[PDB]
Amino acid sequence: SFQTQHDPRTRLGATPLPGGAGTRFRLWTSTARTVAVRVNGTEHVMTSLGGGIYELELPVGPGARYLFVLDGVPTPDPYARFLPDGVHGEAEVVDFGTFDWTDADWHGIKLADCVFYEVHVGTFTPEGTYRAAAEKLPYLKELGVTAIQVMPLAAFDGQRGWGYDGAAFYAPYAPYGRPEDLMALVDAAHRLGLGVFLDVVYNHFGPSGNYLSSYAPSYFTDRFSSAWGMGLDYAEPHMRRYVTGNARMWLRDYHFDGLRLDATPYMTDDSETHILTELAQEIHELGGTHLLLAEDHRNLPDLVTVNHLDGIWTDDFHHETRVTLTGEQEGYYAGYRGGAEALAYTIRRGWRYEGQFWAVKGEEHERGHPSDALEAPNFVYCIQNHDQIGNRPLGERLHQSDGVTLHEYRGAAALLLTLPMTPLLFQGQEWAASTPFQFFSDHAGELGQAVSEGRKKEFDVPDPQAEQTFLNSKLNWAEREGGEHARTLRLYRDLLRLRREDPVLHNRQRENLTTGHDGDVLWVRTVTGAGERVLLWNLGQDTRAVAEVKLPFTVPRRLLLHTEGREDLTLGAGEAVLVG
Ligand SMILES: OC[C@H]1O[C@H](O[C@H]2O[C@H](CO)[C@@H](O)[C@H](O)[C@H]2O)[C@H](O)[C@@H](O)[C@@H]1O
Ligand SMILES: OC[C@H]1O[C@@H](O)[C@H](O)[C@@H](O)[C@@H]1O
Numbered sequence: 001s002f003q004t005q006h007d008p009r010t011r012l013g014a015t016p017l018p019g020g021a022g023t024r025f026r027l028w029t030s031t032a033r034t035v036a037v038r039v040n041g042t043e044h045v046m047t048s049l050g051g052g053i054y055e056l057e058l059p060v061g062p063g064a065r066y067l068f069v070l071d072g073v074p075t076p077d078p079y080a081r082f083l084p085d086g087v088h089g090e091a092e093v094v095d096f097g098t099f100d101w102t103d104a105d106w107h108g109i110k111l112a113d114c115v116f117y118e119v120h121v122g123t124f125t126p127e128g129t130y131r132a133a134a135e136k137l138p139y140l141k142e143l144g145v146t147a148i149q150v151m152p153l154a155a156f157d158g159q160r161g162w163g164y165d166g167a168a169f170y171a172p173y174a175p176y177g178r179p180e181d182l183m184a185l186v187d188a189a190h191r192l193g194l195g196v197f198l199d200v201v202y203n204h205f206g207p208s209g210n211y212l213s214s215y216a217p218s219y220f221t222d223r224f225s226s227a228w229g230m231g232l233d234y235a236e237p238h239m240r241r242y243v244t245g246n247a248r249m250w251l252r253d254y255h256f257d258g259l260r261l262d263a264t265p266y267m268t269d270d271s272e273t274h275i276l277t278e279l280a281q282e283i284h285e286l287g288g289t290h291l292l293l294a295e296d297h298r299n300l301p302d303l304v305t306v307n308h309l310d311g312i313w314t315d316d317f318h319h320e321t322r323v324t325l326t327g328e329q330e331g332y333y334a335g336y337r338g339g340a341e342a343l344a345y346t347i348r349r350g351w352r353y354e355g356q357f358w359a360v361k362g363e364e365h366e367r368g369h370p371s372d373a374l375e376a377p378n379f380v381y382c383i384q385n386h387d388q389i390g391n392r393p394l395g396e397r398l399h400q401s402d403g404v405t406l407h408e409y410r411g412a413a414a415l416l417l418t419l420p421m422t423p424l425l426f427q428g429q430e431w432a433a434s435t436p437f438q439f440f441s442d443h444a445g446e447l448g449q450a451v452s453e454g455r456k457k458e459f460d461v462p463d464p465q466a467e468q469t470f471l472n473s474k475l476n477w478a479e480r481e482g483g484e485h486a487r488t489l490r491l492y493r494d495l496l497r498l499r500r501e502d503p504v505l506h507n508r509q510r511e512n513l514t515t516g517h518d519g520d521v522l523w524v525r526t527v528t529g530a531g532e533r534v535l536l537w538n539l540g541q542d543t544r545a546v547a548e549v550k551l552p553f554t555v556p557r558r559l560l561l562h563t564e565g566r567e568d569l570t571l572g573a574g575e576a577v578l579v580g
C-alpha cells in the first residue's frame, strides 16, 4: 500500500502529451507573480492551478526548445530532460517513448553478482562520450566485470568535470552525448549481459546552473548548508519528489539497473520517513530489480536494514589496504595501522569502526556501529575509486604511490577479487594504468578562479581548471597491450574468471569466511559444501614459503593461482596465492 507520489499527468517540466497533442509544461513556484513559458522564442502565459502550480499545453513536440519566465526573468527549467546549450540555456523537450530498446531479455543484476567497474565518461576514451564508451563494452565483458558504475551525468557547467557539480539532475550532460546516445550505451551493455549503475548526487547541487530557488526558495533551507549553497530541504515534499522523481527517471526511462547515492550522511532529514527510505519505496514501486547503494562513511547498518538500501560503499577496507602498502598517515589515513593482522580484522568485521573512538584530529568521535546484521554482498569494497585516486594532490594511482610495488598491487587485486564482498575496480586499474586521475573542472569567471585558488591552498598541484589536467587523466588504451600493463591485465582476467567459475569462491556468506595472520602473512579462508580455498598474501619484505606459514587448520595443497605465476608454493615479498 505504498503509493508513488508521481503521476505522469502532473509531472513537473515538459512532458509529451498522448495522441500527438504536443507538450504539457508544468512548474511549481512559491513566489512568482507572473509566469510564462517561452517556447521556440514565443512567450505564452501559463495557467495558475493553485498551490503554486502552473501549467500549459501547447502543440509543440519533442525537440522544441523552452525555458520559463518568472516575473519577466527567463529561467532554465530545473526539470529539463536535456540542455543542449548547457545549464544556462533553453531545455529541449524529450520523449522517452521514442527509443527502440532491445533489452527485453535483460532482467537486472543481483548485488552478489556485481563486480563494478567505475567509469568517468569524459576520460574513459579519447572522445569522452557515451558512443565511444559503448565501443569498449566487449572489452569489459571479456575482462570479467559485470556492472559498470558510471560517474554522475547530471548537467553541470563547463566542458569537463567529475560530475559532482551537477545542477540539472534530470538532464544528461550534453558534451557526453544526447539522451539517445546514453540509451544506446545502456542498451548495448544489456545486450552483452552487463549491468549499468549511475552515481547520483542528492546531497547538494553544483554552484552554477541550479535555478530551483528562483522558483521556490523553500526547496532549500538555511538550517544547514552544503559545500556549494543552502542545504536541500527534505522536509519540503517538492524537494523530496525532485530527487525521487529523478531516481525513477534514470531507472525506468534510461534502464539503469541501480543508483549509487553520493554522500548519504549529508542527506539530512528529520522526517518521520527518511528520504532514503522513501527513495527505496519509490524505486521499488517501479516493479523491477533495481538496486540502491549508499556512499556512506558512518558504518551504519540501518542504511540496509531500516532504509532498505541494498549495500554500502565501505572505505575501511580500502584505507586499511592503502596504509598497509604505503604507511601513510595524513588525514583519515591516521585512523588505520595497516598490516596483515589489521586487514584480517577489518575483513572479519566487514568494517573496522563499530563504535570505537575515531581519533583523527578534527574529527574525533565514537565512529560506527556493529556490522553483524550485514552480509558479505552488502559491503562494497575497493582498492581504488574516483575519490581515493583523485583526492590526492597529484591524483596518482595505488601502484604509483611511493613505496608500492607492482607485486603488492597484484596481491591486493587477488585479495579484493576473491573476497565475498562486492568489489569495485576503477577504470584502468586492471592494467596498472600509467595516467593519474586528477581533479578537474571548467567553471566560469570568478567561480573558476576560486576553484583553482582553493585547490592550491588545500595542499606542483595540477590546476583543476587547466585543460591539461583533464587530458592528463585520459586513459591510454594502447599501453595495456604491453609490458607490465599486459601482465597485470592477464592477472585481472584470471582473477575475474576464477571469481566467476570457482564453486567455493561463489560463497557470499560471512559465516563461511575466516581470516588471520602469521607475522606479515594474511590468510583468508572460505569453507563451503563445495570445498575450501585459502588466499595467502605476503605483506612482508622477505620471502615466505607456504609450508612454513603457521595456520590453525591444514593448508590446502593445490595451487589455483599465484599472482606472479610461480610454480611452487612460495611467496616473494608482496605476492599472493590462492590454494584449494
Ligand atoms: O616503521 C615505523 C612505523 O611502523 C609501523 O608502520 C609500519 O607497519 C605497519 C604494520 O604494523 C604497516 O601497515 C605500515 O605500512 C608500516 O609503515 C607503525 O604502525 C608506525 O606508527 C611506525 O611509524
Ligand atoms: O568521503 C568519505 C570520507 O569522509 C572523511 O572526511 C572521513 O574522515 C572518512 O571517514 C571518509 O573516508
Ligand SMILES: OC[C@H]1O[C@H](O)[C@H](O)[C@@H](O)[C@@H]1O
Pocket (backbone or CB within 6 Å): 030, 051, 052, 236, 237, 238
Ligand atoms: O506555499 C504553499 C506550499 O507549497 C507546497 O504545497 C509545498 O509542498 C508546501 O510545503 C508549501 O507550504
Ligand SMILES: [Mg+2]
Pocket (backbone or CB within 6 Å): 518, 519, 550
Ligand atoms: Mg610467525
